Amino acid sequence: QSFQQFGRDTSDFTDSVRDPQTLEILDISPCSFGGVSVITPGTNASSEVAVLYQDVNCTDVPTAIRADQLTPAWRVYSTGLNVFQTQAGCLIGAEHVNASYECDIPIGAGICASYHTQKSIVAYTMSLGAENSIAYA
Amino acid sequence: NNSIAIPTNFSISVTTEVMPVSMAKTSVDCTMYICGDSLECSNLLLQYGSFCTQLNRALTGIAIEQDKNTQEVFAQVKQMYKTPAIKDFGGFNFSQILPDPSKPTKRSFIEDLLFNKVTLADAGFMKQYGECLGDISARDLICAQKFNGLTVLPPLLTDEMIAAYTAALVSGTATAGWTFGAGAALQIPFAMQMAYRFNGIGVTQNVLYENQKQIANQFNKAISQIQESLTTTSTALGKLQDVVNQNAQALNTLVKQLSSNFGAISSVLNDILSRLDKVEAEVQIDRLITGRLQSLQTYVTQQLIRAAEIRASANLAATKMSECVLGQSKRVDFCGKGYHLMSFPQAAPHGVVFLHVTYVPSQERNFTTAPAICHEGKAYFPREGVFVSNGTSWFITQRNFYSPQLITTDNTFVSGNCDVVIGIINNTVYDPL
Amino acid sequence: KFNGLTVLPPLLTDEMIAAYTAALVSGTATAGWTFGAGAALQIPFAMQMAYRFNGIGVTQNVLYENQKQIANQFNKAISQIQESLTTTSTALGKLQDVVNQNAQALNTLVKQLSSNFGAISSVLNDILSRLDKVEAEVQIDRLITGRLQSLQTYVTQQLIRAAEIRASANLAATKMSECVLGQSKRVDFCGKG
Amino acid sequence: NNSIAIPTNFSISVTTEVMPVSMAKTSVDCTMYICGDSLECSNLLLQYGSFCTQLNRALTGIAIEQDKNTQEVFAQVKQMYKTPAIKDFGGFNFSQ
Numbered sequence: 001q002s003f004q005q006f007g008r009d010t011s012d013f014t015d016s017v018r019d020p021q022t023l024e025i026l027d028i029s030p031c032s033f034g035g036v037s038v039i040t041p042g043t044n045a046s047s048e049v050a051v052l053y054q055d056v057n058c059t060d061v062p063t064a065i066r067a068d069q070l071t072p073a074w075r076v077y078s079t080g081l082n083v084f085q086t087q088a089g090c091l092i093g094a095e096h097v098n099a100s101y102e103c104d105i106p107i108g109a110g111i112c113a114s115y116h117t118q119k120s121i122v123a124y125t126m127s128l129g130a131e132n133s134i135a136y137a
Numbered sequence: 138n139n140s141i142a143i144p145t146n147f148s149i150s151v152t153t154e155v156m157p158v159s160m161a162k163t164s165v166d167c168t169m170y171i172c173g174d175s176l177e178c179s180n181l182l183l184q185y186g187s188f189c190t191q192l193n194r195a196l197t198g199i200a201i202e203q204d205k206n207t208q209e210v211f212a213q214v215k216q217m218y219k220t221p222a223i224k225d226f227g228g229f230n231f232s233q234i235l236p237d238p239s240k241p242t243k244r245s246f247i248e249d250l251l252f253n254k255v256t257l258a259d260a261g262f263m264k265q266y267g268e269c270l271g272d273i274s275a276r277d278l279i280c281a282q283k284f285n286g287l288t289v290l291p292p293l294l295t296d297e298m299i300a301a302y303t304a305a306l307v308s309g310t311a312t313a314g315w316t317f318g319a320g321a322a323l324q325i326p327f328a329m330q331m332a333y334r335f336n337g338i339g340v341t342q343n344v345l346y347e348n349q350k351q352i353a354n355q356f357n358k359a360i361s362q363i364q365e366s367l368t369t370t371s372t373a374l375g376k377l378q379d380v381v382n383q384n385a386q387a388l389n390t391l392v393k394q395l396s397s398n399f400g401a402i403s404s405v406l407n408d409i410l411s412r413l414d415k416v417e418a419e420v421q422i423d424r425l426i427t428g429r430l431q432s433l434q435t436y437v438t439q440q441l442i443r444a445a446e447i448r449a450s451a452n453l454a455a456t457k458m459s460e461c462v463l464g465q466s467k468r469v470d471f472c473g474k475g476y477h478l479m480s481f482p483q484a485a486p487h488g489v490v491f492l493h494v495t496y497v498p499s500q501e502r503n504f505t506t507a508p509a510i511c512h513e514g515k516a517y518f519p520r521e522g523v524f525v526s527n528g529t530s531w532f533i534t535q536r537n538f539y540s541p542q543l544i545t546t547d548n549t550f551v552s553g554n555c556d557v558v559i560g561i562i563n564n565t566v567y568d569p570l
Numbered sequence: 571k572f573n574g575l576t577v578l579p580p581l582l583t584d585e586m587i588a589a590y591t592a593a594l595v596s597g598t599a600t601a602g603w604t605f606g607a608g609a610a611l612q613i614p615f616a617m618q619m620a621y622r623f624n625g626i627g628v629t630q631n632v633l634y635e636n637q638k639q640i641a642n643q644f645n646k647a648i649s650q651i652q653e654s655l656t657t658t659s660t661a662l663g664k665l666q667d668v669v670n671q672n673a674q675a676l677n678t679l680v681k682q683l684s685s686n687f688g689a690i691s692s693v694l695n696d697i698l699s700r701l702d703k704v705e706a707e708v709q710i711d712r713l714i715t716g717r718l719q720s721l722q723t724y725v726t727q728q729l730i731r732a733a734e735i736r737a738s739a740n741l742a743a744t745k746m747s748e749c750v751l752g753q754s755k756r757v758d759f760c761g762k763g
Numbered sequence: 764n765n766s767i768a769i770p771t772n773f774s775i776s777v778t779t780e781v782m783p784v785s786m787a788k789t790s791v792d793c794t795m796y797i798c799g800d801s802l803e804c805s806n807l808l809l810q811y812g813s814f815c816t817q818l819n820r821a822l823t824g825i826a827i828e829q830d831k832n833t834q835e836v837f838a839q840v841k842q843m844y845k846t847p848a849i850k851d852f853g854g855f856n857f858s859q
């Protein structure tokens with residue numbers, strides 16, 4: 001409005017503010033920009049992990065986590081060569097194979113990951129079951 | 138005491154039963170909900186870690202059970218029988234329930250009509266996060282839920298993957314019959330399968346082999362009536378809609394409860410931090426922390442109770458899947474109101490829909506009955522069925538359908554004399570010579 | 571009633587539940603088991619009970635020879651039940667426990683109002699009369715929080731008890747459908763025999 | 764390995780099984796329980812409305828389920844067969 005300085009949500013959280021100098025509206029977003037899942041084998045087995053981001057595109061990953069403001073150890077899980085796009089979101093840290101085994105670690109949306117063979121974390125489409133055919137007459 | 142009612146005609150009825158299976162999986166974060174992006178609040182929250190590990194463990198235990206329910210209900214058999222090329226099994230039109238290779242999805246037509254009935258107004262695993270940077274008209278509840286750490290995890294099994302299970306089960310029960318559930322798949326023509334299913338009711342084997350065309354026409358008419366009735370009424374699938382609305386209302390209430398200051402001078406924490414020094418601002422912050430922890434505890438408790446109720450419903454659905462689809466039993470009114478207990482499963486958003494095929498007797502005609510007959514001083518009790526009079530002569534026939542038959546020695550058995558029984562009549566017994 | 575805790579009446583009148591149970595008993599006495607699957611089919615009771623012995627493994631001749639003896643045993647068993655239902659006070663303990671639990675929960679919810687929750691007095695009137703509300707706001711906040719916590723605890727316990735009653739009612743409905751309306755072969759599902 | 768037991772007589776036994784069906788439906792009011800007839804307490808309670816709508820919704824959901832249970836158990840058939848005039852069905856005394 002003409003006299004408004006800041007807007008409010010339904011949770012009484014300020015989402016927009018008016019700049020006192022060069023009057024215009026600025027939006028405010030949280031720094032914790034999304035939900036993150038960590039996919040791991042046992043620590044006694046290995047120490048490599050995979051990271052799942054919810055409902056983002058794998059182009060849009062190093063803008064949704066602010067990769068420039070993070071340590072370089074986190075920066076290797078923002079981009080890379082083993083990126084994969086699922087219906088749940090973007091999975092980085094595990095390569096994608098074409099085979100279909102049983103489910104070990106259920107990632108979501110039909111994907112299961114396992115510590116297959118050096119050994120590394122792989123991602124695959126889970127197998128529904130053994131294919132069978134019956135001859136009707 | 139001497140009149141009976143024996144039906145002369147029957148009918149085939151298909152009834153729908155909808156059962157919820159699973160609900161939405163919700164994950165919460167103590168950070169960016171209780172304190173937000175505030176280091177001063179996060180420093181005081183470190184002493185309440187055990188109050189957060191319990192909530193996370195409870196929610197993960199709920200989510201694993203929700204994923205396990207769909208595994209328990211649908212994947213009864215581990216053999217994926219491919220769908221047959223033909224859809225007519227002895228005059229039975231199965232094209233309405235099996236998928237056809239002319240559409241981008243792999244669901245049946247009735248499954249598409251069921252999926253169009255439920256409106257998924259709530260979101261959490263299909264809405265993009267980058268969409269949450271809209272205008273004043275885009276200030277919706279889902280973006281607030283995502284900004285306050287409330288996330289919805291997607292289910293493990295895709296709906297197109299559930300469709301493969303339901304197509305495999307329907308193909309197996311259409312081709313193999315009841316054999317593939319107990320052991321391996323045993324092929325058998327559908328007509329003898331349906332004759333065997335009639336034999337388990339009490340009706341003789343000849344009735345299907347005489348009236349299979351009329352029975353197939355009644356079956357097709359019933360499926361067409363179900364198809365027509367599933368396109369108009371919006372209250373047929375109210376249970377799944379109620380589950381979705383309850384979950385959305387709980388999440389929206391949890392979001393809206395952040396506006397309470399819990400006795401502090403303000404509800405938002407930013408003016409608490411910027412208006413006072415931290416010596417009494419920590420006293421102000423502690424009340425807000427306690428109130429938000431209480432709200433989280435209440436939400437987790439209600440979600441646990443709802444998950445227990447959904448678990449009970451899913452166990453009942455799995456029992457109905459095992460006992461009524463993979464085979465036929467004699468439990469009264471377990472799956473459908475009638476005699477025949479054969480069923481077909483269909484998928485639905487967070488639920489299953491069973492189509493029960495039942496046999497019901499319709500046309501009635503009264504008769505005179507007698508308990509036994511005394512021919513030559515000996516009682517002749519009927520081996521199966523009851524003794525009936527036409528009005529001038531006597532026959533023996535089964536109770537569930539009127540098929541009169543001449544009284545011979547093979548239809549009856551002899552036991553004792555005919556002076557200890559009450560209401561015995563006198564007639565003749567045919568003996569082949 | 572003065573503290574806002576009310577009990578709503580049930581929808582179905584007991585004298586109208588009696589109509590349902592009389593209808594079921596009359597239907598299973600006259601029609602037999604047929605009126606549940608489809609329409610009501612009249613049949614003499616001796617033939618129906620002989621058919622029920624036929625589903626056990628006993629031949630039809632035993633009833634037609636010993637109908638008077640089994641009728642006398644049936645009448646004697648009902649007379650023994652009638653005599654046993656007038657002396658023992660622990661035969662119906664489950665419903666009494668349900669009623670006592672509900673009454674005790676309501677009485678505890680009433681009696682929990684005497685706790686001041688750290689305020690200088692339990693009742694609010696002397697809180698308002700004794701101080702200005704600058705600090706009596708802080709005093710009333712604690713009482714409000716405590717009473718809200720008590721209401722939350724009562725609602726949670728009521729929800730758990732309602733879930734247990736729902737499970738028992740589902741079992742009772744299954745027994746009504748399978749044992750009264752028809753006859754099956756599940757061992758010890760309804761009665762030891 | 765060559766002996767069997769076969770009963771020569773029987774008996775008819777009637778056993779009782781009592782099962783709960785429903786419980787009492789309870790309604791609560793946040794006003795005139797938490798604050799009573801006091802406008803000063805009622806003014807401060809307006810910030811906790813969402814803490815009371817949840818309780819009311821939960822108790823109404825309990826009450827409707829309690830009403831539904833008795834509907835589910837007893838009314839299996841929708842045809843009210845009238846009571847026959849006689850009570851002796853082949854020597855079976857049903858008058859009790």
Ligand SMILES: *[C@@H]1O[C@H](CO)[C@@H](O[C@@H]2O[C@H](CO)[C@@H](O)[C@H](O)[C@H]2NC(C)=O)[C@H](O)[C@H]1NC(C)=O
Pocket residue numbers: 224225230231232233246361364
């Ligand atoms: C089986 O019944 C359907 C109607 O319920 C018949 O019509 C088909 O309906 C589906 C959608 O319900 C359409 O996709 C088909 O194109 C329809 N077929 C025709 C020929 O119009 C169907 O024909 C029946 N099956 C057979 C073998 O007659």
Ligand SMILES: *[C@@H]1O[C@H](CO)[C@@H](O[C@@H]2O[C@H](CO)[C@@H](O)[C@H](O)[C@H]2NC(C)=O)[C@H](O)[C@H]1NC(C)=O
Pocket residue numbers: 145146147148351354355500
């Ligand atoms: C039993 O009932 C069915 C339908 O309830 C009857 O089938 C109908 O018969 C008439 C004339 O015979 C036809 O015009 C209809 O098209 C039939 N309907 C169907 C769905 O097939 C059947 O004739 C009856 N049988 C007896 C012996 O009464």
Ligand SMILES: *[C@@H]1O[C@H](CO)[C@@H](O[C@@H]2O[C@H](CO)[C@@H](O)[C@H](O)[C@H]2NC(C)=O)[C@H](O)[C@H]1NC(C)=O
Pocket residue numbers: 639642643771772773774
């Ligand atoms: C089987 O047992 C019943 C009772 O358990 C016997 O019936 C009794 O028979 C005696 C003499 O025959 C009568 O005095 C009693 O009044 C009967 N009691 C009842 C309740 O009817 C029956 O006789 C026994 N049958 C055999 C073959 O042993």
Ligand SMILES: *[C@@H]1O[C@H](CO)[C@@H](O[C@@H]2O[C@H](CO)[C@@H](O)[C@H](O)[C@H]2NC(C)=O)[C@H](O)[C@H]1NC(C)=O
Pocket residue numbers: 649652850851856857858859
């Ligand atoms: C059925 O049994 C009862 C006893 O259980 C017989 O006695 C009747 O008992 C009821 C109450 O239990 C009284 O209201 C009746 O007045 C009693 N009747 C008589 C004649 O005293 C009853 O007689 C039996 N039924 C028949 C038809 O004999």
Ligand SMILES: *[C@@H]1O[C@H](CO)[C@@H](O)[C@H](O)[C@H]1NC(C)=O
Pocket residue numbers: 020021022
């Ligand atoms: C001073 O304020 C005016 C308006 O209040 C604004 O336009 C201007 O950019 C500000 N800064 C300077 C250096 O003038």
Ligand SMILES: *[C@@H]1O[C@H](CO)[C@@H](O)[C@H](O)[C@H]1NC(C)=O
Pocket residue numbers: 057267
């Ligand atoms: C992200 O990918 C989806 C398809 O998976 C697409 O519809 C959407 O437009 C993409 N987002 C952006 C910002 O392009």
Ligand SMILES: *[C@@H]1O[C@H](CO)[C@@H](O)[C@H](O)[C@H]1NC(C)=O
Pocket residue numbers: 501502503504
């Ligand atoms: C048979 O006769 C009885 C005696 O009147 C009658 O009540 C019954 O309705 C009749 N049955 C039919 C099918 O008409």
Ligand SMILES: *[C@@H]1O[C@H](CO)[C@@H](O)[C@H](O)[C@H]1NC(C)=O
Pocket residue numbers: 527528529530
């Ligand atoms: C009844 O059945 C007898 C069988 O002998 C038959 O002769 C008669 O025509 C039938 N119909 C009538 C109305 O009696």
Ligand SMILES: *[C@@H]1O[C@H](CO)[C@@H](O)[C@H](O)[C@H]1NC(C)=O
Pocket residue numbers: 138139559560
């Ligand atoms: C059948 O009932 C009638 C009257 O209801 C009676 O006169 C007749 O004796 C009874 N018959 C038998 C065999 O009990």
